[PDB]
Design a protein around this motif. Sequence first.
Motif, PDB file in Angstrom:
ATOM      1  N   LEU A   1      44.649  37.099  42.679  1.00  0.00           N
ATOM      2  CA  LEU A   1      45.318  38.368  42.513  1.00  0.00           C
ATOM      3  C   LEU A   1      44.303  39.521  42.435  1.00  0.00           C
ATOM      4  O   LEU A   1      44.580  40.599  42.980  1.00  0.00           O
ATOM      5  CB  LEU A   1      46.211  38.345  41.272  1.00  0.00           C
ATOM      6  CG  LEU A   1      47.420  37.394  41.329  1.00  0.00           C
ATOM      7  CD1 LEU A   1      48.109  37.541  39.986  1.00  0.00           C
ATOM      8  CD2 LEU A   1      48.414  37.828  42.387  1.00  0.00           C
ATOM      9  N   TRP A   2      43.150  39.265  41.769  1.00  0.00           N
ATOM     10  CA  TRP A   2      42.158  40.322  41.644  1.00  0.00           C
ATOM     11  C   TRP A   2      41.625  40.646  43.030  1.00  0.00           C
ATOM     12  O   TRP A   2      41.439  41.801  43.370  1.00  0.00           O
ATOM     13  CB  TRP A   2      41.034  39.949  40.641  1.00  0.00           C
ATOM     14  CG  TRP A   2      39.987  41.045  40.523  1.00  0.00           C
ATOM     15  CD1 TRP A   2      39.954  42.068  39.613  1.00  0.00           C
ATOM     16  CD2 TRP A   2      38.837  41.195  41.385  1.00  0.00           C
ATOM     17  NE1 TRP A   2      38.847  42.837  39.840  1.00  0.00           N
ATOM     18  CE2 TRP A   2      38.171  42.352  40.934  1.00  0.00           C
ATOM     19  CE3 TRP A   2      38.326  40.467  42.478  1.00  0.00           C
ATOM     20  CZ2 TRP A   2      36.996  42.795  41.532  1.00  0.00           C
ATOM     21  CZ3 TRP A   2      37.179  40.930  43.102  1.00  0.00           C
ATOM     22  CH2 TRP A   2      36.519  42.074  42.610  1.00  0.00           C
ATOM     23  N   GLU A   3      41.289  39.590  43.774  1.00  0.00           N
ATOM     24  CA  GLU A   3      40.682  39.728  45.071  1.00  0.00           C
ATOM     25  C   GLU A   3      41.548  40.544  46.020  1.00  0.00           C
ATOM     26  O   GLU A   3      41.094  41.437  46.699  1.00  0.00           O
ATOM     27  CB  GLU A   3      40.301  38.406  45.704  1.00  0.00           C
ATOM     28  CG  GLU A   3      39.209  37.727  44.895  1.00  0.00           C
ATOM     29  CD  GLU A   3      38.842  36.329  45.393  1.00  0.00           C
ATOM     30  OE1 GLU A   3      39.523  35.824  46.305  1.00  0.00           O
ATOM     31  OE2 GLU A   3      37.856  35.695  44.873  1.00  0.00           O
ATOM     32  N   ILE A   4      42.843  40.167  46.095  1.00  0.00           N
ATOM     33  CA  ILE A   4      43.662  40.785  47.119  1.00  0.00           C
ATOM     34  C   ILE A   4      43.906  42.266  46.795  1.00  0.00           C
ATOM     35  O   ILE A   4      44.053  43.080  47.690  1.00  0.00           O
ATOM     36  CB  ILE A   4      44.995  40.010  47.264  1.00  0.00           C
ATOM     37  CG1 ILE A   4      45.753  40.479  48.545  1.00  0.00           C
ATOM     38  CG2 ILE A   4      45.901  40.225  46.028  1.00  0.00           C
ATOM     39  CD1 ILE A   4      46.810  39.452  49.041  1.00  0.00           C
ATOM     40  N   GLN A   5      43.917  42.602  45.487  1.00  0.00           N
ATOM     41  CA  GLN A   5      44.096  43.998  45.054  1.00  0.00           C
ATOM     42  C   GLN A   5      42.807  44.829  45.161  1.00  0.00           C
ATOM     43  O   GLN A   5      42.888  46.030  45.540  1.00  0.00           O
ATOM     44  CB  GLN A   5      44.679  43.970  43.639  1.00  0.00           C
ATOM     45  CG  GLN A   5      44.896  45.356  43.036  1.00  0.00           C
ATOM     46  CD  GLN A   5      45.780  45.340  41.790  1.00  0.00           C
ATOM     47  OE1 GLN A   5      45.755  44.398  40.972  1.00  0.00           O
ATOM     48  NE2 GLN A   5      46.624  46.359  41.669  1.00  0.00           N
ATOM     49  N   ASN A   6      41.652  44.209  44.861  1.00  0.00           N
ATOM     50  CA  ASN A   6      40.403  44.969  44.627  1.00  0.00           C
ATOM     51  C   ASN A   6      39.367  44.870  45.740  1.00  0.00           C
ATOM     52  O   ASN A   6      38.592  45.822  45.920  1.00  0.00           O
ATOM     53  CB  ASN A   6      39.810  44.627  43.261  1.00  0.00           C
ATOM     54  CG  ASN A   6      40.750  45.101  42.172  1.00  0.00           C
ATOM     55  OD1 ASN A   6      40.996  46.316  42.071  1.00  0.00           O
ATOM     56  ND2 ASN A   6      41.454  44.203  41.496  1.00  0.00           N
ATOM     57  N   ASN A   7      39.307  43.756  46.479  1.00  0.00           N
ATOM     58  CA  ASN A   7      38.371  43.640  47.579  1.00  0.00           C
ATOM     59  C   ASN A   7      38.878  42.597  48.578  1.00  0.00           C
ATOM     60  O   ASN A   7      38.264  41.573  48.881  1.00  0.00           O
ATOM     61  CB  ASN A   7      36.936  43.402  47.070  1.00  0.00           C
ATOM     62  CG  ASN A   7      35.861  43.859  48.034  1.00  0.00           C
ATOM     63  OD1 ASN A   7      36.098  44.105  49.227  1.00  0.00           O
ATOM     64  ND2 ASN A   7      34.623  44.070  47.545  1.00  0.00           N
ATOM     65  N   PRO A   8      40.018  42.891  49.229  1.00  0.00           N
ATOM     66  CA  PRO A   8      40.656  41.878  50.070  1.00  0.00           C
ATOM     67  C   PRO A   8      39.929  41.629  51.381  1.00  0.00           C
ATOM     68  O   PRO A   8      40.171  40.604  51.982  1.00  0.00           O
ATOM     69  CB  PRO A   8      42.015  42.486  50.304  1.00  0.00           C
ATOM     70  CG  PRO A   8      41.746  43.978  50.295  1.00  0.00           C
ATOM     71  CD  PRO A   8      40.805  44.124  49.093  1.00  0.00           C
ATOM     72  N   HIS A   9      38.955  42.508  51.759  1.00  0.00           N
ATOM     73  CA  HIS A   9      38.306  42.320  53.054  1.00  0.00           C
ATOM     74  C   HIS A   9      36.809  41.946  52.914  1.00  0.00           C
ATOM     75  O   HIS A   9      36.126  41.818  53.936  1.00  0.00           O
ATOM     76  CB  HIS A   9      38.464  43.620  53.874  1.00  0.00           C
ATOM     77  CG  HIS A   9      39.876  44.057  54.114  1.00  0.00           C
ATOM     78  ND1 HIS A   9      40.745  43.204  54.785  1.00  0.00           N
ATOM     79  CD2 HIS A   9      40.569  45.120  53.755  1.00  0.00           C
ATOM     80  CE1 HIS A   9      41.938  43.775  54.867  1.00  0.00           C
ATOM     81  NE2 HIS A   9      41.887  44.940  54.228  1.00  0.00           N
ATOM     82  N   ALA A  10      36.428  41.491  51.740  1.00  0.00           N
ATOM     83  CA  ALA A  10      35.038  41.104  51.492  1.00  0.00           C
ATOM     84  C   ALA A  10      34.771  39.711  52.057  1.00  0.00           C
ATOM     85  O   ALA A  10      35.665  38.903  52.311  1.00  0.00           O
ATOM     86  CB  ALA A  10      34.752  41.153  50.017  1.00  0.00           C
ATOM     87  N   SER A  11      33.476  39.387  52.127  1.00  0.00           N
ATOM     88  CA  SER A  11      33.007  38.051  52.395  1.00  0.00           C
ATOM     89  C   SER A  11      33.050  37.249  51.098  1.00  0.00           C
ATOM     90  O   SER A  11      32.470  37.668  50.086  1.00  0.00           O
ATOM     91  CB  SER A  11      31.610  38.192  52.907  1.00  0.00           C
ATOM     92  OG  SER A  11      31.067  36.896  52.999  1.00  0.00           O
ATOM     93  N   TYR A  12      33.782  36.118  51.109  1.00  0.00           N
ATOM     94  CA  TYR A  12      33.870  35.214  49.974  1.00  0.00           C
ATOM     95  C   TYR A  12      33.222  33.860  50.261  1.00  0.00           C
ATOM     96  O   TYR A  12      33.373  32.940  49.466  1.00  0.00           O
ATOM     97  CB  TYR A  12      35.351  35.008  49.605  1.00  0.00           C
ATOM     98  CG  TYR A  12      35.916  36.246  48.927  1.00  0.00           C
ATOM     99  CD1 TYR A  12      35.729  36.481  47.548  1.00  0.00           C
ATOM    100  CD2 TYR A  12      36.698  37.162  49.650  1.00  0.00           C
ATOM    101  CE1 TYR A  12      36.243  37.623  46.941  1.00  0.00           C
ATOM    102  CE2 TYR A  12      37.228  38.278  49.045  1.00  0.00           C
ATOM    103  CZ  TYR A  12      36.975  38.522  47.705  1.00  0.00           C
ATOM    104  OH  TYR A  12      37.410  39.642  47.065  1.00  0.00           O
ATOM    105  N   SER A  13      32.538  33.747  51.398  1.00  0.00           N
ATOM    106  CA  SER A  13      31.686  32.617  51.742  1.00  0.00           C
ATOM    107  C   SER A  13      30.557  32.465  50.708  1.00  0.00           C
ATOM    108  O   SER A  13      30.125  33.508  50.157  1.00  0.00           O
ATOM    109  CB  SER A  13      31.113  32.809  53.123  1.00  0.00           C
ATOM    110  OG  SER A  13      32.139  32.756  54.106  1.00  0.00           O
TER     111      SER A  13
END
Length: 93
Positions: free
Chosen positions: A81-93
Amino acid sequence: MPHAFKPGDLVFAKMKGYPHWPARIDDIADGAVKPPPNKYPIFFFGTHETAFLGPKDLFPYDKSKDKYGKPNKRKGFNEGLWEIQNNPHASYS
């Protein structure tokens, strides 16, 4: 009016046995494994796992967040939930 799903679109994605999960349509990198026909590569926020899903299991995030965007006990969900709201287009690799 809606277009077809494209890389970068934000969704809740539904998998059997799991709650509707914050996710994005991913790109496919050069040389990387492609999805089956009619399927998209879905990256699940929080777990950072990929599955291949069709549109029937993809709910656009803006329309759906009031219903699906609430904390859940499941592993990785609230990080997601944090990711999609706060940095949904980042690299999470």
